[PDB]
Amino acid sequence: TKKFTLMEQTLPVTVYEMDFLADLMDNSELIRNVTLCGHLHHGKTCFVDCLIEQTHPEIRKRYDQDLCYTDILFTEQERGVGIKSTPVTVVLPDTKGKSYLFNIMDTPGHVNFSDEVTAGLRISDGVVLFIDAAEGVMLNTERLIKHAVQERLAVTVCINKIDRLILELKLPPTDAYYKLRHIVDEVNGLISMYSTDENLILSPLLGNVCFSSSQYSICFTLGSFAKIYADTFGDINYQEFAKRLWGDIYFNPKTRKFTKKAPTSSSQRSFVEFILEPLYKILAQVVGDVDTSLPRTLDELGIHLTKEELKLNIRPLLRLVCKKFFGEFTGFVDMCVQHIPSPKVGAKPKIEHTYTGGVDSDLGEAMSDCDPDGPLMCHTTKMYSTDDGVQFHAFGRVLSGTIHAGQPVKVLGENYTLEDEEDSQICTVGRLWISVARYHIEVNRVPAGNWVLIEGVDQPIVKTATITEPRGNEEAQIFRPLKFNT
Amino acid sequence: NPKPFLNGLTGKPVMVKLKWGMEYKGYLVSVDGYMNMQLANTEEYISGHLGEVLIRCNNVLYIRGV
Amino acid sequence: PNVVFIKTEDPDLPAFYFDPLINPISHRSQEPLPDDDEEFELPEFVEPFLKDTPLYTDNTANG
Amino acid sequence: AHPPELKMDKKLSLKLNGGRHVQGILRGFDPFMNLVIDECVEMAQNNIGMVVIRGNSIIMLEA
Amino acid sequence: VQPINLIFRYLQNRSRIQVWLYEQVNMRIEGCIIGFDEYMNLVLDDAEEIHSRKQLGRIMLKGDNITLLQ
Amino acid sequence: GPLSVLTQSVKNNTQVLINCRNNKKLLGRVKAFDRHCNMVLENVKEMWKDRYISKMFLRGDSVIVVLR
Amino acid sequence: KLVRFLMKLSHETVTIELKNGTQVHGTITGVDVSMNTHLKAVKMTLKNREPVQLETLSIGNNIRYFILPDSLPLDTLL
Amino acid sequence: VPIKVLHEAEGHIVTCETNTGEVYRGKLIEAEDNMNCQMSNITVTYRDGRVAQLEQVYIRGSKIRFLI
Amino acid sequence: PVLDWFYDHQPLRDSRKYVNGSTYQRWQFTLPMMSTLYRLANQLLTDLVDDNYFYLFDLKAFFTSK
Amino acid sequence: SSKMLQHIDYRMRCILQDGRIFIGTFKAFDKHMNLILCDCDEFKRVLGLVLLRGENLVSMTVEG
Ligand SMILES: Nc1nc2c(ncn2[C@@H]2O[C@H](COP(=O)(O)OP(=O)(O)OP(=O)(O)O)[C@@H](O)[C@H]2O)c(=O)[nH]1
Ligand SMILES: [Mg+2]
């Protein structure tokens, strides 16, 4: 046998039922098509592992090793690097508990593997960039910022590996705030000099910068952490506290108000005093006072833990403490819902940038409507192999229509045009596979705004292809090929 | 406070007349702190014998304790 | 990813201290700020979580 | 939950819900804005001396 | 004199005060009052409620379910 | 609390008849209640004619009485 | 509980029947903590009268009944 | 700033709509938390158009719905 | 912390808060005595912090080389 | 209580407890949905700047 699968033949619980996800995938309004990208080894795979630990109840990371859920080829496990990009469709709740479908395209951070990132750009509608806090912005992150400017997608930034400033660098809170503010300033300057549009300027106050540590399951925005303070004391407003945290906003404890100037000497900001210093004291109580004042700190946070959890080693105990402190991941859900549009919302510039026929053609507005009815025309760019490697399966978003398994589909190549009908090839779809990383879901009806693997169309496709109805066909043009960064 | 009166009326027989003429006589099993009552083997009219029933917080105009 | 770990010599230095062996940031356009003390003054009994807790111990850097 | 905004202690007419109105000398308010009225003759003159009129159903009070 | 103090005095004296419902004069409850709670909940003691005066004994009325008790 | 949990269990196992304060007598499965009696009922026929509602949410001010 | 389920299913199409008899059936724009919530394309049928198609109607707790759609499993809010 | 808009109308006679349906034109001297404002020379129509005048009217906010 | 029992054949076998008992199977300890022992064992211990020092000097590279 | 920012400029029509429905430009509102709506015309009269309370406003919609 060929052991190149990493396949889960069983289906896990994933907390919720399958039919709630099946009802959520009919929307294409609460569905967010987002590519995770960044530099090499920035905890993006461990971040998707943290989302799998949130959603899948029985799937947990081991203490000794960091698992890699998206990396499913054996070559990725051998080399110890992400190689092939992976899509995951999941139901995610925000701080308000509203369920949103997430079509996530986790990509490797390698510029020689940036072709997969360009394919994930062509499928997805939003981009989340991972930044290591100790390292900052490097060459592949710069080139992906340039390609995101060219691809015209909504980009939000999560800053990963924030524990390297703390445990590994031992920075003062003022200097750590200075480094993070300089990181935000250089990202905003790079957006200014690549992007000609300056309405998007990324700030933690504006809901653009999330903070994360994917080896300890830390993910919060200012709104999420002010929601944590609101759940502690509900007298505050978490929206105004997220407005008043970042950016030289100094707390005045005599008036209990907020100024733009420090009221006394060595007065720190609301961001520093309410986020950086208590998290530093939390980690100091972990790594210095694990037996003396750790249950005192646990009761101060309102968390109850058993004795064997306190007898654990420091890193999985700290991961469990941060998981119980921040709950599940909700700031990222608000990040990709409130600041990254739906296929229905942001359909227009992607189909403008991709379709050679444009959005001005009637099939163009049928594309931009994100219609579950109407034409069944799609674009499959990434076209994976299988576990045995004998047969192949396509993968793509559905720009409009509903794919059915057994419903016939004509596939058209890149060289297809209105006089070249030779690239047209008709096959019915064998099965429709909603792609999670280590398992796939057999579904029947796939509407617009949805990512799905296609079985049985693997013959005429070379790299990318367009997907149309074989009968009742109209003037269907060909989407633009994947122009690579390299 | 009516908390000890509700604790006494819990598991005890009484009648309750509502604003809409709903008079229900029977054994109230449990009444909450906001006077959300629950009854067993009661006969109501406004109807017949309902048996196990419940009420809202203040839907009854007057509770005649038997 | 390369381990760049600061190693301390004395416990006189704090556990959150700028090492001069680290190259300085030299950080160099405004911020979207709300009204300063015109709205949303904080209520009574709101506080950071570990404001009573001290910053660091001598065994903190040991850990 | 508060007292009435008239302190009251005068010959005044209080109208309840449904327009039922009495007139008499007020004595004092309550936490539910309930007024005790002395010689509360119903101006629609039934008075029983000590009339405990509830502010939950009381709608208006004019001198 | 506060109305809560007047209701407590009427409950202590158990006077046969004519009491109506919350803006509803269909039942005029005249009779002794056993006691009053802190949330103005009234307990009657064989108060005849004329519609058909039928005194029953211990009857509990809510704090805002009575409008005029004189 | 416990009585509301027992009423929700009886509504899940049988057909509970809740007569709300909007004259809505609904026989069916009351899915959940609340501390403010925000009641959600799943697949209940309500008479205002017992028209079936697949999921009905009602407030505690608009509810009056329940029965198993 | 029920407010959290309404906030979760506050994008689908539901009917809100008020205490005044106004039945606004349409897509939910947003559900607040209170009963004052904004709806989208609601055909508010009046009491024994016709409907009015309002693209933005904000509700007080006058909205009594809420006929919810089938976009809510048994363990979706449990 | 609705409280400021209500406070800017103090010392003048304005018309208000009642919960029953009446229209009352009057001038207030002070206001309360539950809209139980003390008003002088208030003429209330009693939902029939017959304006009757009263003084020192501490009419509660359950009676008065809005402005008219 | 290591001042008493550092030279015993069974150092902390008596202590129930550290070991399971007389079988001497599993140890559960405190941070300052690992700090003291980590300071004391500096001669035998290495100073490397990552496997990136072992670039092609690793076991997979040696298996490839053979 | 949170619908004031959506109708802080556009006109809205709300029905009070009297049954009168007034359409006007909501300029300000209170925390208990007591919305001061300037230039309110009730269906026919004019109420001016009318502060319609949250309990009074049983039904409302966006007119302008
Ligand atoms: N110090 C530190 N390391 C982390 C953190 N989060 C993740 N890592 C480590 O970073 C390593 C590499 O990141 P991956 O999880 O493989 O994600 P990735 O960025 O997609 O990796 P590539 O595909 O190579 O780009 C993981 O094995 C983790 O051990 C963190 O918060 N702090
Ligand atoms: Mg990776």
Q: Are H30 and H37 in contact (CB under 8 A)?
A: yes
Q: Which residues contact A130 (CB under 8 A, 6 or more apart)?
A: A36, A37, A38, A39, A42, A43, A44, A47, A109, A158, A159, A160, A212
- The domain in which residue J1 lies consists of 1-64
List of residues 6+ apart from A236 with CB closer than 8 A: A226, A229, A230, C42, C43, C46
As separate numbers, helices (DSSP H) first and strands (DSSP E) second, chain C gives 1, 0
Q: Which residues 6+ apart lie within 8 Å of D11 measured at CB?
A: D23, D24, D25, D63
**F61 in helix, strand or coil?**
coil
The alpha carbon dihedral of E1, E3, E5, E11 has a sign of positive
**Which residue in A15, A20, A30, A55 has the most chain G C-beta atoms within 10 A of its own C-beta, making it the best mutation to test that interface?**
A20
Q: Which of D34, D60, D61 to substitute to test the interface with H, most H CBs within 10 Å?
A: D60
CB-based contact, A297 to chain C, within 8 Å: yes
Full set of structural domains in chain G with CATH? 1-78 (2.30.30.100)
Query: Could F32 and G2 be called an inter-chain contact, meaning their C-beta atoms sit closer than 8 Å?
Result: yes
The answer to whether the CB atoms of G65 and F55 lie below 8 A apart is: no
Q: A389 alpha carbon to ligand 2 midpoint, in Å?
A: 22
Q: How many angstroms is it from A85 CA to the middle of ligand 2?
A: 9
Nearest to B62 among E39, E57, E59 (CB): E59
SS3 content of chain C, % helix, strand, coil (to 5): 10, 0, 90
Hey, is the C-beta of H61 within 8 angstroms of any chain D C-beta?
no
In angstroms, how far is the first alpha carbon of chain A from the final one?
A: 36
Domain containing residue F55: CATH number: 2.30.30.100
CB contact A311 to I (< 8 Å): yes
Verify E-I touch: 3 or more CB pairs within 8 A: no
For the domain made up of E2-70, the CATH class stated in words is mainly beta
Whether A319 lines ligand 1, by a CB cut-off of 6 Å, is no
CA distance A233 to C43: 9
Query: Subunits touching E (CB < 8 Å, at least 3 pairs)?
Result: B, D
Burial tier of A297 (Cβ tally within 10 Å: 0-12, 13-18, 19+): buried
Q: ∠ CA G33-G36-G42 to the nearest 5 degrees?
A: 120
H helix runs in A288-400, sequence order: 294-300, 307-310, 314-326, 331-338, 347-354, 362-368
Q: With a 6 A CB cut-off, is A322 part of the ligand 1 pocket?
A: no
* Angstrom distance (rounded) from CA A405 to CA F64: 51
Q: Closest ligand 1 atom to the C-alpha of A110?
A: 25
Residue G42 sits at φ, ψ, to 5 deg, of -85, 125
DSSP A5: -
Q: Structural domain tally of chain J? A: 1
Give the domain CATH number at H41: 2.30.30.100
Tell me if A101 sits within 8 A of A147, measured CB to CB: no
What separation in Å is there between the alpha carbon of A42 and the centre of ligand 1? 5
Q: Resolution (in Å) of the shown entry?
A: 5.9
Domain count, chain F: 1
Instruction: Give the pair of three-digit tokens for residue J42.
Output: 């009730």
Mark out the alpha helices in chain F (DSSP H runs).
Answer: 2-13
What does the angle CA F2 – CA F5 – CA F8 come to, to the nearest 5 degrees? 155
Q: Please name the amino acid found at residue I23.
A: T
Method of determination is cryo-EM
Return the HEC string of A131-149.
EECCCECCHHHHHHHHHHH
Asked whether the beta carbons of A444 and A428 are under 8 A apart, the reply is no
Whole-number Cα distances in Å, J51 to A327, C17, H19, J38, J62: 42, 58, 14, 9, 16
Contacts of E66 (CB under 8 A, 6+ apart): D54, E19, E20, E21, E22, E42
> A413: Cβ below 6 Å to ligand 1?
no
A346 within ligand 1 shell (Cβ under 6 A): no
Dist CA A287 CA A166 (whole Å)? 11
Is I31 in contact with A288 (Cβ distance < 8 A)?
yes
List of E strands, G23-70: 23-30, 38-45, 51-54, 57-58, 63-67
Which structure tokens are listed for B6? 């509700």
Rounded Cα gap, residues H32 and H17, in angstroms:
17
Beta bridge partners of G25: G15, G43
**Chains with ≥3 CB–CB distances under 8 Å to D:** E, H
**DSSP letter at A289?**
-
Domain range enclosing H49: 1-68
Give every strand in the sheet of J21-29, ordered side by side.
J45-52, J35-42, J21-29, J11-15, J59-62
**Do J58 and G56 lie within an 8 Å CB cutoff?**
no
Q: What is the DSSP letter of A284?
A: H
| Domains parsed from chain D with CATH numbers | 7-63 (2.30.30.100)
How remote is the CA of residue A40 from the centroid of ligand 1, in Å? 8
Domain region containing B50: 1-66
Ligand nearest to the CA of A42: 1
| DSSP reduced 3-state for A123 | helix
Counting the structural domains of chain B, the total is 1
* Of A211, A214, A219, A138, nearest in space to A177 by CA: A211
CATH code, domain carrying B60: 2.30.30.100
The bound ligand whose nearest atom lies closest to the alpha carbon of A140 is: 1
